Ligand binder design. Structure first.
Ligand SMILES: C[C@H]1O[C@H](O[C@H]2[C@H](O)[C@@H](O)[C@H](O)O[C@@H]2CO)[C@H](O)[C@@H](O)[C@@H]1N[C@H]1C=C(CO)[C@@H](O[C@H]2O[C@H](CO)[C@@H](O)[C@H](O)[C@H]2O)[C@H](O)[C@H]1O
Ligand SMILES: OC[C@H]1O[C@@H](O)[C@H](O)[C@@H](O)[C@@H]1O
Ligand SMILES: OC[C@H]1O[C@H](O)[C@H](O)[C@@H](O)[C@@H]1O
Ligand SMILES: OC[C@H]1O[C@H](O)[C@H](O)[C@@H](O)[C@@H]1O
Ligand SMILES: [Ca+2]
Ligand SMILES: [Ca+2]
Length: 686
């Protein structure tokens, strides 16, 4: 299939995602609406159910509202059955309209629809070449008080109707009972409850296996992507085995939400995108795009620096989901904000690297503050707003122009208010010029691009006041004045003669799994895929065509590999690095070490003999381990994804700066379970 196919569930850079709060989009079936205190048909109480459902999204795909816009992926509210309680928080009544308060991950939320409505949504979306991404929130079930078992549904978790347990009298320890987080540390935020949500205990084998069985069920129903909620609040080791479960079973594009505020750059955030096996919502892009295009607290140099810097800091920048607002931010468009600002920011996101996500109602200029006011019902389904037309013209370029789906980003002209950047992938080029100043025209002189000579028409058709670009010899453009608020997109596409890899998904899997390599110039005839210097040819290449290769990961040792393609003619591609071949299936094991006293700045880490534990390398050791919530110093603990069903050797070490102190004695051995979790409780060997 080509890279742009609806069946490419592994990579979404050629897609434009439309993020839908199911309840707030279209009530296509009023018979499934909540009744009583849980429902507000006027949707003026934004914490109640307004009635929107999966039949409503089907109707909007069918009648061309979503497809007219060029949307090729929808991201909907978590589909699982939620609690039915209307919770009163100091006066306001609150319901599970948002899908985040699960009670059964194997059943649907009936307000949204039946399991048959879900399959009809999947099939209708696919028949219209729309991929379906669902939220999945495995961190917690629902508001619970162990002190008051009658509050809400006491966080109860059911397994396809069968009650597993609740928060009060949790003798099985399905949940964490350490109090609520104050967000002071990542550890604190992981093992304590978010607010009052009953925190699931992923170290409990029943919880571990249940959530992994539940995600496989939704993958069996044909979902094409997963947005994981609260990745900052679950153990990294468990989420890496969770990702290995998905990737070793049916790999689909998975990204998580790790919130970053304005100007916050976090190494942990970047480590998570680079090493977890899922990508992230690109809050670094979103916050800077809002600073430059919305709030004017930064200028185009800030924008250039984020684009240049993010291309390096994210190992796979083409997998990051970009957006200018979403459910956790005030809407981009303000009451007194010029609409041109929204239209430019959307033109910027749609032509930028990564996977653009448009929050529902952006095209209808919805404004609103923070939750719940950014989740109002969308007011109109008008197909003629300028913002609808901006998405309609630019979203198709993700499928048709590989420079926009995969290309590098090159700033070609800039000043405080104007950026002209170029996306390049082989000989495919897109050039985007944006003047954010709504008053001053920009005189552009000396612009050089990679466009062949010609008179390029603005793909936006002058609707954001763009113009034709005349390109002469050597990509030099004839000088022009960029209008106040002007935005223009110029492009050139042609065939790639060289194999060029633009994206690979999944990026972590065991031997035997088929990965998807997308790009251009692979040719029709089966060539060679290199994992390191290991050639994979012939029958292990499951599919080969010019834009997409599907190949089985060879049985190489676990570790990180560069991928490279050589077409049938021996021409080799660029290297696509950081592929992790896992040692096998994964299980999360909790390692607990007692009596590991440390100095200030000295932390305990774990390493061992499998790639998953850094292969005995102190620079790649797992940690720093935790030592405050589940166990307290000098006992340290950490949840680590390790190969299932085997004896690993490992040792703990203390690291402070450059100094590694290994524990003495013989290497430790442990035989990991085949599924479920295990705890290793040991004592520091001096
Ligand atoms: C729990 C959230 O924590 C992080 O995001 C926060 C961030 O820390 C704040 O500084 C920022 O101002 O707001 C964000 C949202 O609260 C984390 O990175 C996020 O992934 C995470 N937000 C998720 C999770 C939930 C579950 O609580 C959603 O909230 C919903 O639940 C509450 C109470 O249970 C309901 O009353 C709300 O109506 C729901 O939105 C977040 O919206 C979701 O984005
Ligand atoms: O500073 C690193 C470590 O040093 C210890 O002295 C301290 O008691 C621990 O709580 C800390 O994690
Ligand atoms: O008035 C606004 C209401 O919104 C929130 O849900 C608060 O929890 C609640 O206590 C407050 O009174
Ligand atoms: O057998 C004990 C030895 O095992 C491991 O290879 C450790 O790397 C080493 O530092 C330790 O001293
Ligand atoms: Ca309904
Ligand atoms: Ca948690």
């Amino acid at each position: 299939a080509p890279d742009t196919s609806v069946s490419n569930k592994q990579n979404f850079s050629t897609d434009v995602i439309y993020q839908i709060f199911t309840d707030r989009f279209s009530d296509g079936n009023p018979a499934n609406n909540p009744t009583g205190a849980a429902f507000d048909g006027s949707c003026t109480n934004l914490r109640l159910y307004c009635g929107g459902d999966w039949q409503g999204i089907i109707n909007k795909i069918n009648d061309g509202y979503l497809t007219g816009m060029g949307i090729t992926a929808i991201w909907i509210s978590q589909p699982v059955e939620n609690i039915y309680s209307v919770i009163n928080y100091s006066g306001v009544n609150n319901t599970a309209y948002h899908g985040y308060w699960a009670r059964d991950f194997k059943k649907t939320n009936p307000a949204y629809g039946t399991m048959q409505d879900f399959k009809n949504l999947i099939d209708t979306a696919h028949a219209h070449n729309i991929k379906v991404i669902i939220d999945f929130a495995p961190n917690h079930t629902s508001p619970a008080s162990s002190d008051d078992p009658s509050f809400a549904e006491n966080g109860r978790l059911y397994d396809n109707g069968n009650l597993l347990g609740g928060y009060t009298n949790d003798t099985q320890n399905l949940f964490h009972h350490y109090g609520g987080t104050d967000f002071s540390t990542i550890e604190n935020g992981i093992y304590k409850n978010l607010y009052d949500l009953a925190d699931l205990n992923h170290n409990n084998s029943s919880v571990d296996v249940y959530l992994k069985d539940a995600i496989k069920m939704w993958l069996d129903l044909g979902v094409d992507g997963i947005r994981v909620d609260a990745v900052k609040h679950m153990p990294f080791g468990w989420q890496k085995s969770f990702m290995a479960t998905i990737n070793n079973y049916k790999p689909v594009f998975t990204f998580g939400e790790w919130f970053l505020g304005v100007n916050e750059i976090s190494p942990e955030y970047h480590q998570f995108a680079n090493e977890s096996g899922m990508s992230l919502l690109d809050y670094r892009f979103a916050q800077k795009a809002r600073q430059v295009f919305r709030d004017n607290t930064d200028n185009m140099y800030g924008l250039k620096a984020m684009l240049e810097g993010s291309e390096v800091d994210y190992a796979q920048v083409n997998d990051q989901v970009t957006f200018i607002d979403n459910h956790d931010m005030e809407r981009f468009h303000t009451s007194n904000g010029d609409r041109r600002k929204l239209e430019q920011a959307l033109a910027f996101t749609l032509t930028s690297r990564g996977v653009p996500a448009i929050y529902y109602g952006s095209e209808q200029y919805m404004s609103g503050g923070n939750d719940p006011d950014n989740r109002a019902r969308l007011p109109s389904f008008s197909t003629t707003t300028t913002a609808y037309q901006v998405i309609q013209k630019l979203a198709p370029l993700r499928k048709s122009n590989p420079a926009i789906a995969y290309g590098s980003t090159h700033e070609r002209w800039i000043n405080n208010d104007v950026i002209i950047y170029e996306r390049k992938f082989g000989n495919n080029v897109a050039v985007v010029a944006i003047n954010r100043n709504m008053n001053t025209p920009a005189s552009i002189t000396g612009l050089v691009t990679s466009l062949p000579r010609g008179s390029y028409n603005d793909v936006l058709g002058g609707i954001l006041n763009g113009n034709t670009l005349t390109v002469g010899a050597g990509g030099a453009a004839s000088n022009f004045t960029l209008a106040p608020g002007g935005t223009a997109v110029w492009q050139y596409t042609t065939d790639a003669t060289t194999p060029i890899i633009g994206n690979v998904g999944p990026m972590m899997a065991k031997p035997g799994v088929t990965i998807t390599i997308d790009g251009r110039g692979f040719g029709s005839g089966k060539g060679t895929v290199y994992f390191g210097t290991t050639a994979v040819t012939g029958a292990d290449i499951v599919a080969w065509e010019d834009t997409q290769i599907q190949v089985k990961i060879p049985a190489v040792p676990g570790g990180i590999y560069d991928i490279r393609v050589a077409n049938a003619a021996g021409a080799a591609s660029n290297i696509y690095d950081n592929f992790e071949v896992l040692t096998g299936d994964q299980v999360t094991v909790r390692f607990v070490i007692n009596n590991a006293t440390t100095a200030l700045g000295q932390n305990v880490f774990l390493t061992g003999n499998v790639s998953e534990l850094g292969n005995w390398d102190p620079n790649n050791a797992i940690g720093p381990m935790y030592n405050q919530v589940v166990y307290q110093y000098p006992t340290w603990y950490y949840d680590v994804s390790v190969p299932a069903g085997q004896t690993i050797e490992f040792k703990f070490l203390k690291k402070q700066g450059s100094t590694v102190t290994w524990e003495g004695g013989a290497n430790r051995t442990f035989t990991t379970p085949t599924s479920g979790t295990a705890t290793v409780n040991v004592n520091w060997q001096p």
